[PDB]
Amino acid sequence: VVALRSRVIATMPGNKGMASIAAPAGEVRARIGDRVEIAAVNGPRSVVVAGDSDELDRLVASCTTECIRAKRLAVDYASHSSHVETIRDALHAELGEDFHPLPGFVPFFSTVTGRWTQPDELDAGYWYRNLRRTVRFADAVRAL
Amino acid sequence: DVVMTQSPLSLPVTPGEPASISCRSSQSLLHSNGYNYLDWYLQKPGQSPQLLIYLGSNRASGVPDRFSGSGSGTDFTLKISRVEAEDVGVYYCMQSLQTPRLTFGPGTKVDIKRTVAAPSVFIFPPSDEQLKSGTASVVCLLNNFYPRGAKVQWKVQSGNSQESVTEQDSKDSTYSLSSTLTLSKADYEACEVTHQGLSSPVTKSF
Amino acid sequence: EVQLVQSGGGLVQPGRSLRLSCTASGFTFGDYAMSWVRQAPGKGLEWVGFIRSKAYGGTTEYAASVKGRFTISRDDSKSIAYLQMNSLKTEDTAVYYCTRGGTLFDYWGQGTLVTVSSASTKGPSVFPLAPSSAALGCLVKDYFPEPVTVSWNSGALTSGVHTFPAVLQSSGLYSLSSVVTVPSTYICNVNHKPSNTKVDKKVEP
């Protein structure tokens, strides 16, 4: 799944990337714009952002004017948006063609739902949700 | 001649209850040394057999004293004092007098004892995509029946049916049968059982 | 303490040779007469043969069905008992055992699943079970060899699940029928480990 996802996604760089910052959800979510969305809220004051280029680079530059941990991700690729959602074959189902969901076992934790789930959704649909919806990691940590 | 060794080949035994399995020996296995020459073997389902009782009465070491044993010149009796959820398997009445030992005997189906249930005769016509795939397998499923003393008929006759009967589970303690009728293309265009759970045959077709 | 662990399983065609070794540890190997037992799947045991102790010397006595086909040897310094299979055929598809005595099989090896089948390794023909009006199942016909696990709702439903045993056809293939019994639209998945043929299935009446 991860190998094929990376293989197919290696073409989209040059259009957009992703960034990870520790900025309070409220402010960043107020000032996002021009094809920029919060990919993953990892806390009340830590959010991961997936937006288009020339402003997501300036989103971290919007985080160096406030002097916070600035890391322009050299692994920038496309996720949690529609530029990746267009391919419904290679990046939606060709990643995982085989899957064997487990029962309760020890409670794992998913994020895109924001709550604990059974391990029946862990398949190519989960990666489709990761590339389509947000992550809501903060709600996941609160539920944990 | 060969001594015919035959035990009641089925012993429905329930946990906490004393049972007793006997054996036929057509000839006399009480040898001149004063010791019987018969062996009691238990093949644990999914594991190797175990030596329970040798020389007719002498128990082996390692196995619990539950397996007590005795017998006459011909008639033998393994006095299983008590059965648990572990004591369920196949008991072999093996004579050790005239080597070779090719035949171990059919074996005794020792089963967790419970009252008689109603076999759920479930006729299942084969899927049509199988019929366009080149084969046909109608299955007459039997579920939750005990004891397992029924075979499924195939009328309207039989001869193409194979058996896939499962083992005994724990909390339900029943059996399940799979009469698979492998078939061919043209002959596609009924199953009944004679289990002691009922008396009249139940006839349901595809 | 005593162990008689075995080795030498595999998949063969009728007419070739196979290896079976009985590892001896914990005792004097030359005292007891090593014997070999064959257990047909799900039904009665059949005895193969034994070799007498070299202190006894004696001979190697075999079953009437394996005259001129199987031979048995023994050695003390390296302490391995041998069951040599030559000119194998269909009946030899069974789990063989290594027993500790010619007349007193007091010990019992764990069992090596020796399979002599003419089939080849390929995925199963998963064929469903449309309910009459009830229980829902899915046959797993035409598969080989026999590692297999069939779950329902992808390992979510466990009550009423009956993983029926292997079904031996004349073509050397296998068939399994896992069926659940519950009133209702269920998922059954079969995973054949050797071939990686992972089939998911939706069933309706």
Give CATH superfamily name and number for C127-203.
Immunoglobulins (2.60.40.10)
Strand-pairing partners, residue B91, are B42, B108
CA–CA separation, B39 vs C102, rounded Å?
13
Contact C9, C19 (CB under 8 A): no
Elucidation technique? cryo-EM
CA–CA separation, C200 vs C179, rounded Å?
15
Q: Which of B113, B138, B165 is the last residue of a domain?
A: B113
Task: Choose among C49, C42, C61: nearest CA to C22.
Answer: C49
Q: Give C-chain residues touching A102 at CB under 8 angstroms.
A: 155
Fold of domain C3-116: Immunoglobulin-like (2.60.40)
Number of domains forming the structure of chain B: 2
Contact B178, C164 (CB under 8 A): yes
User: To 5 degrees, how large is the angle CA B151–CA B154–CA B160?
Assistant: 90
- Report resolution in angstroms: 4.1
Cβ within 8 Å of B, C 164-183: 164-169, 175-177, 179, 181
| Residue A144, number of CB atoms within 10 A of its CB | 9
Whether B102 and B183 share a structural domain = no
CA–CA separation, A79 vs A12, rounded Å?
10
Residue C33 per-residue DSSP state: P
Any idea how long chain A is? 144
Whether B152 and B201 share a structural domain = yes
Q: Which of B113, B139, B156 is the last residue of a domain?
A: B113
Q: Do C105 and B54 touch (CB under 8 A)?
A: no
| Residue C198, number of CB atoms within 10 A of its CB | 15
Instruction: Evaluate the CA torsion angle C91, C97, C98, C102 in order and state its sign.
Output: negative
Mutate: best of A1, A97, A98, A122, partner C, most C CBs <10 A: A98
List, as one string, the DSSP characters of C164-201: PPP---TTS-EEEEEEEE-----EEEEEETTTTEEEEE
**Structural element, H or E, at residue C47:** strand C45-51
Chains within contact range of chain C (3+ C-beta pairs < 8 Å): A, B
In C, minimum Cα distance to A123 occurs at C154
Collapsing DSSP to helix, strand or coil, B183 comes out as: strand
Q: Do B102 and C63 touch (CB under 8 A)?
A: yes
Cβ within 8 Å of C, A 36-95: none
Range of the domain at B102: 1-113
Contact A15, A36 (CB under 8 A): no
Task: Choose among A49, A43, A44, A56: nearest CA to A16.
Answer: A56
- For residue B153, CA distances in Å to B12, B134, B140, B174, B178 come to 25, 24, 9, 21, 12
Whether B137 and B103 share a structural domain = no
Residue B48 per-residue DSSP state: -
Q: Do C163 and B120 touch (CB under 8 A)?
A: no
In C, minimum Cα distance to B132 occurs at C127
**Cα dihedral C199→C200→C204→C205 (10° resolution):** 30
Q: How many Å lie between the alpha carbon of B42 and the closest alpha carbon of chain C?
A: 11
Q: Which of B71, B91, B113 is the last residue of a domain?
A: B113
CA–CA separation, C11 vs B194, rounded Å?
39
Q: Give B-chain residues touching C110 at CB under 8 angstroms.
A: 47-48
Q: Which residues of A91-104 are buried (b: 16+ CB within 10 A; e: fewer)?
A: bbeebbeebebeee
List, as one string, the DSSP characters of B184-206: -SGGG--B----TT-SS---B--
Whether B171 and B101 share a structural domain = no
Q: Give C-chain residues touching A98 at CB under 8 angstroms.
A: 196, 198
State the burial class of residue C152 (Cβ atoms within 10 Å of its Cβ: 0-12, 13-18, 19+).
Answer: buried
